[PDB]
Each structure stands twice: as C-alpha cells, then as structure tokens.
Enzyme design. Sequence first.
Site, PDB file in Angstrom:
ATOM      1  N   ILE A  13      -4.432  12.341   8.516  1.00  0.00           N
ATOM      2  CA  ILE A  13      -3.528  13.429   8.117  1.00  0.00           C
ATOM      3  C   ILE A  13      -4.071  14.089   6.850  1.00  0.00           C
ATOM      4  O   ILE A  13      -4.257  13.433   5.834  1.00  0.00           O
ATOM      5  CB  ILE A  13      -2.095  12.918   7.852  1.00  0.00           C
ATOM      6  N   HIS A  17      -0.709  -0.115 -15.625  1.00  0.00           N
ATOM      7  CA  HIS A  17       0.290  -1.185 -15.727  1.00  0.00           C
ATOM      8  C   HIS A  17      -0.069  -2.245 -16.788  1.00  0.00           C
ATOM      9  O   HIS A  17       0.810  -2.784 -17.475  1.00  0.00           O
ATOM     10  CB  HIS A  17       0.514  -1.865 -14.376  1.00  0.00           C
ATOM     11  N   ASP A  63      13.551  -1.771  -3.912  1.00  0.00           N
ATOM     12  CA  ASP A  63      12.435  -1.318  -4.749  1.00  0.00           C
ATOM     13  C   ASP A  63      12.714  -1.597  -6.248  1.00  0.00           C
ATOM     14  O   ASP A  63      12.409  -0.779  -7.118  1.00  0.00           O
ATOM     15  CB  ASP A  63      12.182   0.167  -4.474  1.00  0.00           C
ATOM     16  N   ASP A  99      -6.954   7.793  -8.862  1.00  0.00           N
ATOM     17  CA  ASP A  99      -5.619   7.745  -9.430  1.00  0.00           C
ATOM     18  C   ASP A  99      -4.967   6.370  -9.118  1.00  0.00           C
ATOM     19  O   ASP A  99      -4.215   5.877  -9.917  1.00  0.00           O
ATOM     20  CB  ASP A  99      -4.741   8.948  -8.956  1.00  0.00           C
ATOM     21  N   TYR A 156      10.192  -4.252 -15.186  1.00  0.00           N
ATOM     22  CA  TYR A 156       9.942  -3.595 -13.889  1.00  0.00           C
ATOM     23  C   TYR A 156      11.194  -3.495 -13.002  1.00  0.00           C
ATOM     24  O   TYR A 156      11.231  -3.987 -11.866  1.00  0.00           O
ATOM     25  CB  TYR A 156       8.767  -4.257 -13.149  1.00  0.00           C
ATOM     26  N   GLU A 209      -3.703  10.462  -2.597  1.00  0.00           N
ATOM     27  CA  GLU A 209      -4.123  11.375  -1.523  1.00  0.00           C
ATOM     28  C   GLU A 209      -5.516  11.016  -0.970  1.00  0.00           C
ATOM     29  O   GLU A 209      -5.779  11.171   0.219  1.00  0.00           O
ATOM     30  CB  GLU A 209      -4.055  12.834  -2.002  1.00  0.00           C
ATOM     31  N   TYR A 241      -4.777   7.656   1.359  1.00  0.00           N
ATOM     32  CA  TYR A 241      -3.627   7.589   2.227  1.00  0.00           C
ATOM     33  C   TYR A 241      -3.917   8.345   3.537  1.00  0.00           C
ATOM     34  O   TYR A 241      -4.499   9.425   3.490  1.00  0.00           O
ATOM     35  CB  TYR A 241      -2.440   8.213   1.488  1.00  0.00           C
ATOM     36  N   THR A 242      -3.523   7.764   4.673  1.00  0.00           N
ATOM     37  CA  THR A 242      -3.506   8.419   6.004  1.00  0.00           C
ATOM     38  C   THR A 242      -4.780   9.214   6.324  1.00  0.00           C
ATOM     39  O   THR A 242      -4.765  10.467   6.275  1.00  0.00           O
ATOM     40  CB  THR A 242      -2.250   9.341   6.191  1.00  0.00           C
ATOM     41  N   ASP A 267     -24.760  -9.566  -4.984  1.00  0.00           N
ATOM     42  CA  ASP A 267     -25.568  -8.771  -4.068  1.00  0.00           C
ATOM     43  C   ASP A 267     -27.062  -9.080  -4.254  1.00  0.00           C
ATOM     44  O   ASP A 267     -27.564  -9.151  -5.376  1.00  0.00           O
ATOM     45  CB  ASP A 267     -25.302  -7.273  -4.283  1.00  0.00           C
ATOM     46  N   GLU A 314      -7.742  11.054 -13.246  1.00  0.00           N
ATOM     47  CA  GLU A 314      -8.291  11.876 -12.147  1.00  0.00           C
ATOM     48  C   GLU A 314      -8.790  13.234 -12.661  1.00  0.00           C
ATOM     49  O   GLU A 314      -9.885  13.668 -12.304  1.00  0.00           O
ATOM     50  CB  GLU A 314      -7.268  12.073 -11.031  1.00  0.00           C
ATOM     51  N   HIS A 361       9.793   3.131  -7.810  1.00  0.00           N
ATOM     52  CA  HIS A 361       8.831   4.080  -7.231  1.00  0.00           C
ATOM     53  C   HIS A 361       9.518   5.352  -6.727  1.00  0.00           C
ATOM     54  O   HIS A 361       8.853   6.275  -6.245  1.00  0.00           O
ATOM     55  CB  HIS A 361       8.123   3.436  -6.054  1.00  0.00           C
ATOM     56  N   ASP A 392     -29.866  -7.368  -3.616  1.00  0.00           N
ATOM     57  CA  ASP A 392     -30.883  -6.361  -3.917  1.00  0.00           C
ATOM     58  C   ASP A 392     -30.423  -5.207  -4.837  1.00  0.00           C
ATOM     59  O   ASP A 392     -31.182  -4.300  -5.109  1.00  0.00           O
ATOM     60  CB  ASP A 392     -31.515  -5.833  -2.617  1.00  0.00           C
ATOM     61  N   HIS A 408      -3.835   4.049 -12.071  1.00  0.00           N
ATOM     62  CA  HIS A 408      -2.435   3.661 -11.952  1.00  0.00           C
ATOM     63  C   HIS A 408      -2.271   2.151 -12.172  1.00  0.00           C
ATOM     64  O   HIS A 408      -1.441   1.717 -12.962  1.00  0.00           O
ATOM     65  CB  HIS A 408      -1.903   4.058 -10.547  1.00  0.00           C
ATOM     66  N   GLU A 409      -3.063   1.353 -11.471  1.00  0.00           N
ATOM     67  CA  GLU A 409      -2.910  -0.099 -11.551  1.00  0.00           C
ATOM     68  C   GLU A 409      -3.305  -0.624 -12.944  1.00  0.00           C
ATOM     69  O   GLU A 409      -2.583  -1.444 -13.514  1.00  0.00           O
ATOM     70  CB  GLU A 409      -3.701  -0.816 -10.435  1.00  0.00           C
ATOM     71  N   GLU A 469       6.520   2.827 -13.793  1.00  0.00           N
ATOM     72  CA  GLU A 469       5.893   3.542 -12.668  1.00  0.00           C
ATOM     73  C   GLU A 469       5.366   4.937 -12.994  1.00  0.00           C
ATOM     74  O   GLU A 469       4.219   5.263 -12.659  1.00  0.00           O
ATOM     75  CB  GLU A 469       6.856   3.596 -11.459  1.00  0.00           C
TER      76      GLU A 469
HETATM   77  N1  LIG Z   1       2.704   1.254  -4.520  1.00  0.00           N
HETATM   78  C1  LIG Z   1       4.005   1.657  -4.000  1.00  0.00           C
HETATM   79  C2  LIG Z   1       3.838   2.571  -2.793  1.00  0.00           C
HETATM   80  C3  LIG Z   1       3.172   1.919  -1.628  1.00  0.00           C
HETATM   81  C4  LIG Z   1       1.842   1.757  -1.440  1.00  0.00           C
HETATM   82  N2  LIG Z   1       1.602   1.115  -0.246  1.00  0.00           N
HETATM   83  C5  LIG Z   1       2.800   0.845   0.358  1.00  0.00           C
HETATM   84  C6  LIG Z   1       3.072   0.210   1.581  1.00  0.00           C
HETATM   85  C7  LIG Z   1       4.391   0.070   1.946  1.00  0.00           C
HETATM   86  C8  LIG Z   1       5.442   0.555   1.118  1.00  0.00           C
HETATM   87  C9  LIG Z   1       5.161   1.198  -0.097  1.00  0.00           C
HETATM   88  C10 LIG Z   1       3.817   1.336  -0.490  1.00  0.00           C
HETATM   89  C11 LIG Z   1       4.836   0.429  -3.664  1.00  0.00           C
HETATM   90  O1  LIG Z   1       4.338  -0.700  -3.750  1.00  0.00           O
HETATM   91  O2  LIG Z   1       6.018   0.526  -3.311  1.00  0.00           O
HETATM   92 CA   LIG Z   2      -4.021  11.619   4.337  1.00  0.00          CA
HETATM   93 CA   LIG Z   3      -4.221  12.423  -7.137  1.00  0.00          CA
HETATM   94 CA   LIG Z   4      -7.308  14.320  -5.924  1.00  0.00          CA
HETATM   95 CA   LIG Z   5     -27.257  -5.004  -1.140  1.00  0.00          CA
HETATM   96 ZN   LIG Z   6       2.734   0.934 -10.002  1.00  0.00          ZN
END
Ligand SMILES: N[C@@H](Cc1c[nH]c2ccccc12)C(=O)O
Ligand SMILES: [Ca+2]
Ligand SMILES: [Ca+2]
Ligand SMILES: [Ca+2]
Ligand SMILES: [Ca+2]
Ligand SMILES: [Zn+2]
EC number: 3.4.24.27
Length: 316
Positions: free
Chosen positions: A197, A146, A226, A138, A157, A190, A193-194, A57, A177, A231, A59, A142-143, A166
């Site tokens: 929603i 692993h 899976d 989170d 896995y 959360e 995601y979405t 970057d 978190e 998961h 600046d 989470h990642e 998982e």
């Molecule tokens: N991380 C989980 C859940 C997930 C995240 N994004 C996704 C998109 C499609 C299906 C599942 C997921 C998985 O890989 O399964």
């Molecule tokens: Ca959402």
């Molecule tokens: Ca959370």
């Molecule tokens: Ca939260």
């Molecule tokens: Ca910049």
């Molecule tokens: Zn995972």
Amino acid sequence: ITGTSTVGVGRGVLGDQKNINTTYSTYYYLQDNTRGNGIFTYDAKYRTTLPGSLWADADNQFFASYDAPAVDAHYYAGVTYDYYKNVHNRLSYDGNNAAIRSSVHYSQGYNNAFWNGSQMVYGDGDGQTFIPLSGGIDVVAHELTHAVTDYTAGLIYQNESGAINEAISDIFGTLVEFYANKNPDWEIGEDVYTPGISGDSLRSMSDPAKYGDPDHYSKRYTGTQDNGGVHINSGIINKAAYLISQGGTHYGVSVVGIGRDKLGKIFYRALTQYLTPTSNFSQLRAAAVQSATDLYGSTSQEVASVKQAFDAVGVK
Ligand SMILES: N[C@@H](Cc1c[nH]c2ccccc12)C(=O)O
Ligand SMILES: [Ca+2]
Ligand SMILES: [Ca+2]
Ligand SMILES: [Ca+2]
Ligand SMILES: [Ca+2]
Ligand SMILES: [Zn+2]
C-alpha cells in the site's frame, strides 16, 4: 569485543547502500567504536531471547537479505546518536555516552519494535503489515527516544503521561528523519508499513485523525486499552508539535509556525528541564511555554505560537 575499528558496506531494508562502522577480531562485528561507548547490533535469530549474539560477518560486506535489518538498525542508531549530539549536545541516551544496543530478527513475523528498558528490539514484520522495522529511520529514532525519555523526564507509560511519552518519541523520531533528510515527512513508520500500500503509515502528526487518532482534547480516548490510549492520545500532542513547527489553522485556531529546529529546542528543553514522570497534557503545555520563555523571551513569537498550538488542540 576488543578489536580494530573498520568500515563495512551493505544494503538496508529498502535496498540502499550504506557504509557501517564495524570492529574486526577474527570476524567483522556490528560494533561502531566511533560513537560514545559504542553502538552494538545483535542477531536475535528469530527467537525472543535478548540481546542474542553480537552480529558477526566473515567479510565485512552486508548485502544478504538477512543482513538488511541489521545494517539499518546499526546505521540509524548512529544517525540518531549524531542528531542528539550535534543538535542538542546530548551524548547518547543517558547524556553520558551509554553504549547503544539493538537486536534484529526478533521472533517470527513480529509486526513491532520496542525499547525494552535496556536496548532497542526489531521484528521482521510478517511481510504484509510490515517489512523489517529497523528500515524506518523514524521507527529507530522513536525507540531510542524512549531511552532518552527514561533518563530525563521518566514519563510513566500510561494515560496522559504515557501519551506524552509516545508523542516525544514521534516528535524526535520525525526530527531525526528530517535531520537525515531522506524523504522526510510528518507521518510515522511509512517506510516499513504495508509494502503493498502506497502512501500510508501507522500515525500522522499533521493529521492524526487520518488513522483514527484524536487531534483535540475533546476527542481524547478515556478507556483502558493501550495503557489508557498512549499511542492514541499522542495524536493530540503530535498535532500540537506539528502546528508549532509548521503552523496552520486547526478547529478555527490559527498558529504561526516557528520551524522544526525551534520545535526541537523547545520540546528538548521541556523534556530535560520541566517534565516529570507524572506530567499531564496541561503540565506539558506549561513546560513548553516556560521552555520557549527561557529560550526566546516571554513576549516572543515563539511563546505565542506554543500557546496557539495548545489552544488549537484544546489543551489549557
Ligand atoms: N508501536 C505501536 C503501533 C504498532 C506497531 N505495530 C503494531 C502491531 C499491532 C498493533 C499496534 C502496532 C504499538 O505498539 O501499539
Ligand atoms: Ca505502506
Ligand atoms: Ca516518517
Ligand atoms: Ca519519510
Ligand atoms: Ca558478509
Ligand atoms: Zn513508542
């Protein structure tokens, strides 16, 4: 890169302003020299070649929309590092200050994130199912958990071993978190995601069945998708971890909660001392019971509560 440690400022995926440790050498790079052997964040530039280029970057201000995912991947890797150091006296994921590397803008409209064996990788989402995935503390924890797992138990896995793998990532992702103390909860993803929603997420640890996941051994997924439901059957363990921490009565079995810090101590000890690559749920129960025994004593409330929680999810 070689250079001077500096502090930049930007905004994350959710519009929040935060300072970030950078390194100056002609450009300001996303390279935090303050944490172990460093935290390095890269741009995958909508491609799938990894790691991509160390984020540069001009600046040291990171307020562009394109910057947002990098800011958060970088910042939340650092918070996760602090968690393991301050809470478990673990130095990075290997326990030896390994450099933590993350790439953002992975592929186009990529609705996921992952640890690839070597680094964390974050999609931008397609804007409907997900916004950029490093926006979830989170998700990041989470990642990176692993990698902790890879270096400790090495849980394979697939099947029960993989569902434990998982769950460990959901458990520590959640504990990070809470540690960071920004809108903490027992749901997963959360924050990213979405965007259309309110109040949903990928998974719930307090009620896994909310999103179709088993909450009792009798309801385990036994198919092949899976990787044998890693998961999906994580819901059984997530529920047990939730009960251990918060307590409650689940299918008529009562659990006295012992809190998040004791949950973390017990599962961190199980993970680093007792779990093996092929550990199943039953062996996880034994590991957790022995871990609480080591820490609190065989006759402690803590051991009783671990036993109640596994009973409650039908894991003997
Ligand atoms: N991380 C989980 C859940 C997930 C995240 N994004 C996704 C998109 C499609 C299906 C599942 C997921 C998985 O890989 O399964
Ligand atoms: Ca959402
Ligand atoms: Ca959370
Ligand atoms: Ca939260
Ligand atoms: Ca910049
Ligand atoms: Zn995972």
